[PDB]
Symmetry: D2
Subunit: 475 residues, 4 copies
């Protein structure tokens, strides 16, 4: 059972719109909209959407495996050793949000202050004292982007596993010599940083020049979750306000994916005429280049919808029916739809490019899709027993012999985390929250396993969060 098996379960269901069914269905955690800062839906005038892993959720692990296979094949095509071809994607290893340290070749799980929570070299998990060799003070400057790359999106799951695969492979292949910062094979030296760049280069290449889009699009049912409730929610949003798309993908890929997402023999509800996906939007903007989009952007271009090519020159006209934009900036949306930032709820999965940047730079309201939350919620509810024991121990430790009491902490956190995978939960390692968890609470006003959970809330719900108090204020 993958996490997209949960999302494709609730997606096979038409929506009963009885107002008592929605209110009851909503309270079940898998379908909740969780609230970090209060938000009055009545004050939202425009709903904006990312596409990949927001409107179009790729089925796991089929999709990660395809991208891992194509990336491996690209690396062998440029000179990496044939053995890579026998790697096979394993979804139980990687967790989103890890940090690859290009100096020492470790995958790290860190908290919001860059404290080490987990450290794996290949598939060898480094325990506390040994990590102090390379990380005295057990800490990284997580903003040193020359050394550290944060694998933040579901797109990075294949490379998260692949980096571990390569470090493992070269460590144990007798042709090579392990050094602190990479591998020697005679007179060639491959630094972990060189190796990491090649992987990054290869993932980009399969997305933009290799065959991943092609293989995706010729088997959409295998790779893309489709849900009849998406065209219903979009039309319901259009009655209360404006709806826009602002995606980084190009127009040809956007059109194929979006057409499939609406490929039902009805429109919004069973019985209605099907409508083209474009009619569900007041403003369609491709090639957005977020997060640069939320600063100065690029020049506003117009897509030739017939050919998929951009018209030559900078588009100067007004919003008009039928038009598709390329490039531009967030200010394109605000001007063309007559919106201020806090009239906008932007809905996306990139904690950095979609959410953090639209909040800090423009004051937009934010909705973070976290697809793994379905499986994360399952593990967290089912094995709540262990976390409750965790919190019990954490307190009796403070009253105080703790020779053996710290041992039961470190034991209990390990086996709690293992239920999620080898890199543990996306949101925590034991009693300690991750960087990712921290940025969710900090920059996502709302979050949910799927944006579809908005369908189960009335037109003008007021999402409510608890007010926050400083220590001295609750004294």
């Amino acid at each position: 059972t993958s996490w997209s098996d949960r999302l494709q379960n609730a997606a096979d269901m038409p929506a009963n719109m009885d107002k008592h069914a929605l209110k009851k269905y909503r309270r079940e955690a898998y379908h909740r909209v969780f609230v970090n800062r209060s938000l009055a839906m009545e004050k939202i005038k425009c709903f904006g959407f990312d596409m990949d892993y927001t409107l179009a959720v790729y089925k796991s692990p089929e999709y990660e495996s395809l991208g891992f296979e194509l990336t491996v094949e690209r690396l062998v095509s440029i000179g990496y050793p044939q053995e890579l071809l026998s790697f096979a994607y394993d979804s139980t290893f990687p967790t989103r949000g890890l940090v690859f340290d290009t100096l020492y070749g470790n995958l790290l799980k860190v908290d919001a202050y860059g404290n080490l929570l987990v450290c794996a070299h290949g598939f060898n998990f480094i325990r506390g004292p040994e990590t102090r060799e390379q990380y005295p003070n057990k800490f990284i400057q997580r903003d040193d982007t020359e050394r550290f790359y944060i694998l933040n999106t579901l797109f990075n799951l294949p490379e998260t596993y692949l980096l571990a695969c390569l470090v493992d492979f070269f460590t144990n292949c007798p042709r090579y010599t392990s050094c602190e910062t990479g591998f020697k094979d005679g007179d060639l030296f491959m630094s972990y940083r060189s190796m990491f760049q090649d992987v990054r280069d290869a993932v980009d290449w399969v997305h933009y020049k290799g065959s991943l889009k092609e293989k995706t699009v010729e088997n959409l049912e295998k790779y893309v979750v489709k849900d009849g409730k998406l065209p219903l929610l979009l039309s319901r949003m259009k009655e209360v306000g404006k709806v826009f798309l602002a995606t980084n993908s190009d127009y040809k890929y956007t059109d194929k994916i979006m057409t499939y997402l609406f490929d039902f023999p009805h429109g919004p509800k069973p019985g209605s005429s099907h409508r083209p996906w474009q009619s569900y939007f007041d403003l369609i903007l491709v090639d957005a280049r977020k997060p640069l989009f939320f600063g100065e952007g690029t020049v506003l271009r117009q897509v030739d919808t017939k050919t998929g090519k951009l018209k030559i020159g900078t588009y100067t006209g007004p919003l008009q029916h039928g038009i598709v934009y390329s490039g531009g900036s967030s200010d394109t949306i605000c001007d063309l739809l007559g919106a201020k930032g806090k009239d906008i709820l932007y809905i996306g999965d990139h904690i950095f490019g979609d959410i953090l940047k639209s909040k800090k730079r423009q004051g937009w309201r934010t909705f973070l899709v976290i697809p793994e939350l379905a499986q994360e919620l399952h593990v967290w509810t089912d094995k709540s027993s262990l976390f409750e024991e965790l919190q019990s121990l954490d307190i009796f430790l403070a009253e105080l012999d703790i020779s053996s009491i710290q041992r039961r902490i470190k034991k209990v956190t390990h086996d709690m985390d293992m239920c999620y995978g080898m890199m543990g939960s996306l949101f925590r390692s034991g009693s300690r929250q991750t960087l990712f968890a921290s940025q969710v609470m900090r920059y996502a006003d709302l979050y949910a396993a799927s944006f579809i959970n908005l369908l189960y809330y009335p037109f003008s719900y007021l999402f409510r969060a608890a007010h926050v108090l400083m220590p001295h204020e609750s004294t």
Copy 2:
């Protein structure tokens, strides 16, 4: 009653060290150490200190008034109009942490997302709808440091008032014409940004070339809080670990101020031989240039303690008795004292230069001194009635006629805030926390009205904070 009147009350008291007196005295809020993240004092090996507004608290409002007077006199000396001379510092206007917007000449109180909480143009407080003229979406990109200057330290209190004074004066002086971005007087145009730079230039100048140090040092009792409990706490720290000073001030000013802070006819306790302030420290470092200190720093220099001048050349020797350093970096301290970052508790008042930077860049533990917390606590406890009514209204608003219910919110927040001053509380505006409050919770592990509150806690106390849960985790 200023906030330094509170601190100079508890400072006139010798410390009863009965372990039941400390535990009871400690529970009184004014003397608490408040905890944002748990901290095990037993694991702290080095205590490090800022000086100004940490070890040496300047009496308010005498000191702010002196700096305001000298800054005003400097501006008139370079050409500003004589009327400035009749300005007089008013401590009830400014609150620390405001943001001056150099484009439109407004002082702003913002929350952590840059949402406008208060907006004053001179002494005219701009209400909601009118702020939308200049701030559509009622938001600023608080990291656009070319436009926005955050007045963060107690040193900025005089210029916080002075900026309002000037905007007020030029607005109402018939010689000038108000424009959106400044004032015209015939063929001269003074932009708010030009004017702001002159004020900043003048404050620097009185601190580093004018007479402020001179007038301070020739009347230390008038300007500097002195507390017999400081040499006691320092010596107690020296028995459990190492103690260091790392201040931005130069050695001559540091020596005068520190000598006075120890100017008692006894040592640590009444009855003991007085010792020079230098003997309370294992490492003394002046000219630190924090926050650059916490990155690459500057070259390590050695102070000629006899002359107050720096020796020529880069100091290459070891830590040795008697030596004073200039420049260097945080890594100087770690090497020379054999410490990792989390063995260090650094104690200071600069939320940015002392606390935020030492946490994000080095993983140091942090203790934030907030001198105004004494008065803030008084107002918050005494007028708790109003905040309790505030939180009641905030909830019954969510159940729902709110024509009149929002009016009682906006009324009640105003008169709550007024009890603090015209710019309201340092930590909140009504039910909404400030940027400053947010950075306290985020980067200060501990905080307190005074670092002296550490004296009332046992040698190896474990400061405990509540563990944090994401919404879906408490579901």
Copy 3:
């Protein structure tokens, strides 16, 4: 008669090596080595070579036309109007070294101080007074690289003509409206700067992703000058010193081109065994990325000569027989061949990337190939009559009615220049030298229509230039 018709005339000749034949053949201007600063061939220990337009001269105008055709086809493929397809390359329009001004869409010929010598908007040559509208003071800051692009290499000849073609086409096509900085077609605006970037993008694309290499390599005789005297000169250099290749091209293209350059049924001289091109070199370095090569360079890589792919990792071994390098820096050559900069004579055609940068950054000796010099010399010798009249007028103008005397200057310069082409001589406009001419004299120690002219000079010739005197020094 193109300029590569001259070079392919002298190239069809085997070399008579009688020492009286070389000395006599050498004195003919077409075969001279011209000298800007004295150079003692005996002190040269390494000869280094660029490839494209140095060892491999592309036949004109076949090659420029092919690149123009492919670039035009690429632009139409991305959306430019079909009419572009009817453009046809005209070799009589462009002169190398022109400056495209992306603001106003003009091709400019400038002197070393950026003074305007010629200004063409499309095919309309703008005369003096009208250029003052857009260029008051008739001058450009030629180092403002955001606005001005200097078309410096023979590779830029197709785009030099194409830029004029497009400006002409849009100016006169009634679908568009000419503005100061570009063209409007309804709601699309194409700035000259946008248009220029598209041309630059398209030329790069045909070189690195389109078919230009493919079409070149499948008809080498049509496109590439081949000369039996090249393998003779290379072997003669190898007896006095070391020989190296440092080209920006990749290894697969380098191998095809170089193999053809040595494709004779003999070796160095008729009668000798043919040898592979690689045996003529002590150090072969591809992917050089000059001029970055002459600063920090890139990492040294090793080419897998069997597959044409780079081996993975950084090459750490020594110079060894058979090895081909990728990347690296000029310091790779100096270390591996044991050379200082002034032991090196580097031979190339890029006045900036090959010559200027190797002189200013490393102190290398320099040999500039100028292929057009053959035709330039012909025009300059044959029509010397007119330049002699020019210099006569220039002086009698100084003795002084010059109403009519300036008119004969401006007339005589025009018809002198026209004998070269519509953009006039590469080296001058009338009595005024071009930027290009200035950088030749300034940074090329030697220059010549072909590097083959070195064959006609004895092993240890001392190339001699006149010593330079300041005005006050000849007083």
Copy 4:
């Protein structure tokens, strides 16, 4: 006999304005205007002037000695050893235009390509082979401004000698240990780069905070050349065009110096009413901050001529009588006087800040004052014998035993150069021109020992330079 002894000889002379006296007086080399590029005086509409070492020439060696003394005293005041106090300025050591290499502590004389011509470590002149230890290839990247500082103005003559003095002193003082990059004294390390920064800091300090202006102004006759022919030339320029001042000095210093330069009991000619210096100018601009002046500049300010302070705010009015400007840009002058760049002849002594930058960035015409040219001309004319022998040897060397022929070259260049000083001529070392000589020919259209030499040329002279030919063009 210093070089300002020559300039103060011709300055004690009233100007006979007989047109045959000027034409004859002019031909004497000391009073020539030398011409690098032809210039038609009739086309000059504005004459612009620097002040220091242009209108106000400081008497040598009195002035350099005063600045050396004050700089030495400042260094001892901050901690340098007392022995510095016994240094005494020696005008026979330094030559303008040397390059201090902050890595190895050498003064270098270089040519335009950065080839080493002279290399002195302290007062030890390093001969060829030993310089190869630190400068393989005998070359420096003269644009690496982090390592190399070019001492370009007469203001740098005191520090040129002082740098040698310090390197000499520390090398030979037994308290210190010489290392490749500086000196050790126990646990202090003084790098040459640290030491160089202290000297630079100290020279700035005496100019802007110490007493150099004060001591200058209270003994102007001792320190400043005064010439009755200056007010005559200025008034003659005002009849043919506009005259402006654009100096980096502030208004109070400018007024003292300029007032003295006009302190005669007559006006332009003996017998005329004296006029204030300000009446000789159409536009006076102080605080120019050249060369930044020739790019974006700073904001235009207005000087309060009564107080010497800048008025508050940005000056927006027009050119009006009596007004003095501060800051601004070269475009201030062009707009306010209605000039294009080539209507301007700017007259100054800074080869970089005044001449090179105004030519490359704005296309201004240029007049370089070189005060040492008077003495340089004397040495060059009087000892022409030796340079003529030099050029004879340079040629017979090319015909060819040169074991002994190179020895007579290296001997003859040494004793030629010695007649100028220990660092030799400003313009050459033997047969090789210096960087400085090269930038004179390259960027100064005219040059002269004094700008006063313009008085001896008729109103609309056409300064004529020989036209330049490339090698292949004179073939």
